From a paper:
Cyclic adenosine monophosphate (cAMP)-dependent protein kinase ([name]) is a serine/threonine (Ser/Thr) protein kinase that regulates various biochemical processes including metabolism, memory, growth, and cellular differentiation. In the absence of cAMP, [name] in cells exists as a holoenzyme complex consisting of a regulatory (R) subunit dimer and two catalytic (C) subunits. All R-subunits have an N-terminal dimerization/ docking (D/D) domain, a disordered linker region harboring an inhibitor sequence, and two tandem cAMP binding domains (CNB-A and CNB-B). RI-subunits are thus inhibitors of the C-subunit, while the [name]-subunits are substrates as well as inhibitors of the C-subunit.
To ascertain whether calcium could substitute for magnesium in the autophosphorylation of the [name]β holoenzyme or whether it trapped an ATP:Ca complex, we diffused CaATP into the apo nucleotide-free [name]β2:C2 holoenzyme crystals. The [name]β(1–416, R230K)2:C2 tetrameric enzyme was crystallized and then soaked overnight in 5 mM CaCl2 and 1 mM ATP. Both products, Ca2ADP and pRIIβ, were trapped at the active site cleft. The overall nucleotide-bound structure and the nucleotide-free apo structures are very similar, with a Cα RMSD of 0.67 Å between Mg2ADP bound and the apo [name]β2: C2 structure, 0.65 Å between Ca2:ADP bound and the apo structure, and 0.46 Å between the two nucleotide-bound structures. Thus, although CaATP was not capable of efficient steady-state catalysis for the cAMP-bound [name]β subunit as shown in the steady-state experiments above, calcium can facilitate phosphoryl transfer to the [name]β holoenzyme in solution under single turnover conditions.
Numbering used by the authors:
A (entry chain A): 104 to 121, 130 to 324, 337 to 392
B (entry chain B): 14 to 350
The structure:
């Protein structure tokens, strides 16, 4: 051999990011979250992106014998089984066959969430059952919107940083591209006094208490700390700890430099 | 030299960009000889100009099919962008036009066929053979990026060899002008950057990613990430974990790691020194970036021509008749074409 078959381009619907909630039981939700845990497109998701997406999933009922999907039938839809039994089968030529089975578990269609991809088999309800469905345009809006809301603005935080005021836009986005997130529990230590100053932080939610060896500051949403790691690597004068549950933006400072060179060069210009 | 000319290319482009060429010619100015490729959707043809007797490649696009597949915005890009750029390795748009049923881009013929076809026949490429091609893409992507244009579809099926063994980049369907960040999930599966897959929003970085892939394929004979079902290909691309065949010279495999880097803070082309990181790499030591640009370098392969209008380096498709309806279709959507 299949060595000479060319590889077609693929392309999903556009959404330039510049109301949907389908009720489901507490448990129905958890089971749904576990059936998606290890699916590529869900693995790596804000638990809020995840939550938004799990809202979007619509209920789909089926009487026994009903066709959930038809081979070659359109696949703009991902499906995860709630309850029921299900036969899978393919008309391989030529020849209609049964392949495997479904017993109240299992999913199919994920590639649909990326681009149009005609179901490879017909799935048939071997009893009364229910599924949750997800359609590509819906799913992609959610996730595109959610990231754009997390891109500009993730920045403002960055452009409220005195050391970075003199960055160009093309450069600040470079940082928006990669800046990580960290989540912290009550009293968990964010920074350790006398530790190598490896990166700076910005609070997205919660409160951070800066203390020395004696409360010497409290940071709320939109406020930075450790920001000295940019100008010098000399050991933290103070420590940081979480007050409640904090989420932090964390930027390793070296990475910063691979992108932009040393922050001090910036703070000239 | 290296200094002003930049600005001149943007001066040039911008001026052509804001007021594009329109219905240069028309269908009956051409004879339709043979299909070269089934465009989606789609059909690229060899055509003989009449007044000149000279040959071209005609890209026929069914206006309705484009609308049904939702490629309105992309199509306008292909054409707008293509008739506004100029660079020795970008294919030339000679005339453009439309009629009741189709859109037409007429281009220079590249008799040599697709890289893909050669690569596949030949198995793989020696490294200097790979390097020679890869140099043109690097220079081409710098030209494009400088204008704030990304290409987004790098693959040996969109890279054609011209009569002098050089390359002409070809399919601009996904090319676009991005000042901040763009989100469309598009390209070719084996070549998608991980940020595209995960809908992170992205710009110039994805091209350089794709460059790493191309190069690895040009030298290996197969791409870095492959698998039975696509989702597994994506799974692999997201781990960015890659094996190199035994024969990859150490410097090659070194370059591939810097380009095939899922971590944007470490991916060549994307860092402080931009592209120079790639040019002044270790796998381009023997490359005189100036020479290649002037096409003064010995091509490690010249496709065999015959007379003009020879299609030997291309595959054979079944010829259907190009229907032009008496009813104009989708007029409003392509006004700007
Ligand atoms: N100017 C040209 N000269 C020779 N062959 C071409 C030319 N343009 C396109 N082709 C061939 O026709 C096919 C379609 O090109 P492309 O622009 O990729 O259309 P699509 O993206 O719809 O497939 C390609 O595989 C290419 O080999
Ligand atoms: Ca193509
Ligand atoms: Ca295309």
């Amino acid at each position: 051999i299949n060595r000479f078959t060319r590889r077609a381009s693929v392309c999903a619907e556009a959404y330039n990011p510049d109301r949907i909630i389908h009720p489901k039981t507490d448990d129905q939700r958890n089971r749904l979250q576990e059936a998606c845990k290890d699916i590529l497109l869900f693995k790596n998701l804000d638990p809020e992106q995840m939550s938004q997406v799990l809202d979007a999933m619509f209920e789909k009922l089926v009487k026994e014998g009903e066709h959930v999907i038809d081979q070659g039938d359109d696949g703009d839809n991902f499906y995860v089984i709630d309850r029921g039994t299900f036969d899978i089968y393919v008309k391989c030529d030529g020849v209609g066959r049964c392949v495997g089975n479904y017993d109240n578990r299992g999913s199919f269609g994920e590639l649909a969430l990326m681009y149009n991809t005609p179901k490879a088999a017909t799935i048939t309800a071997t009893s009364p059952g229910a599924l949750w469905g997800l359609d590509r345009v819906t799913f992609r809006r959610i996730i595109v919107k959610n990231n754009a809301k997390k891109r500009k603005m993730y920045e403002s935080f960055i452009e409220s940083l005195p050391f970075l005021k003199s960055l160009e836009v093309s450069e600040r986005l470079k940082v928006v591209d990669v800046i990580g997130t960290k989540v912290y529990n009550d009293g968990e230590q964010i920074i350790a006094q006398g530790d190598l100053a490896d990166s700076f932080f910005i609070v997205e939610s919660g409160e951070v208490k800066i203390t020395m060896k004696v409360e010497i500051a409290r940071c709320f949403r939109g406020q930075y700390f450790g920001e000295l790691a940019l100008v010098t690597n000399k050991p933290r004068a103070a420590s940081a700890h979480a007050i409640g549950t904090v989420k932090c933006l964390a930027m390793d400072v070296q990475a910063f430099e691979r992108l932009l060179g040393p922050c001090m060069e910036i703070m000239k210009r | 030299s290296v200094k002003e000319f930049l600005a001149k290319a943007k001066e040039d482009f911008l001026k052509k960009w804001e007021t594009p060429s329109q219905n240069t010619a028309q269908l009956d100015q051409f004879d339709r000889i043979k299909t070269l490729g089934t465009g989606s959707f789609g059909r690229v043809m060899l055509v003989k100009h009449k007044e000149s007797g000279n040959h071209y490649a005609m890209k026929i696009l069914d206006k309705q099919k484009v609308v049904k597949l939702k490629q309105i915005e992309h199509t306008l890009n292909e054409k707008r962008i293509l008739q506004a750029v100029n660079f020795p390795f970008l294919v030339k748009l000679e005339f453009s036009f439309k009629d009741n049923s189709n859109l037409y881009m007429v281009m220079e013929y590249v008799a040599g066929g697709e890289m893909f076809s050669h690569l596949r026949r030949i198995g793989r490429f020696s490294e200097p053979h790979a390097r020679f091609y890869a140099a043109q893409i690097v220079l081409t992507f710098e030209y494009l990026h400088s204008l704030d244009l990304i290409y987004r579809d790098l693959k040996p099926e969109n890279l054609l060899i011209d009569q002098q063994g050089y390359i002409q980049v070809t399919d601009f369907g996904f090319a676009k002008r991005v000042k901040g960040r763009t989100w469309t999930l598009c390209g070719t599966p084996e070549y998608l950057a991980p940020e595209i897959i995960l809908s992170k929003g992205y710009n110039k970085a994805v091209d350089w990613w794709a460059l790493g892939v191309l190069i690895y394929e040009m030298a290996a004979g197969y791409p870095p990430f492959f698998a039975d079902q696509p989702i597994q290909i994506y799974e692999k691309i997201v781990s960015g974990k890659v094996r190199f065949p035994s024969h990859f010279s150490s410097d090659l495999k070194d370059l591939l790691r810097n380009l095939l880097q899922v971590d944007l803070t470490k991916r060549f082309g994307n860092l402080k020194n931009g592209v120079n990181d790639i040019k002044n790499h270790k796998w381009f030591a023997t490359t005189d970036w100036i020479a290649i640009y002037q096409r003064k370098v010995e091509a490690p392969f010249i496709p065999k021509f015959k007379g003009p209008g020879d299609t030997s380096n291309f595959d054979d498709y079944e010829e259907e008749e190009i229907r032009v309806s008496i009813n104009e279709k989708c007029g409003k959507e392509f006004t700007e074409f």
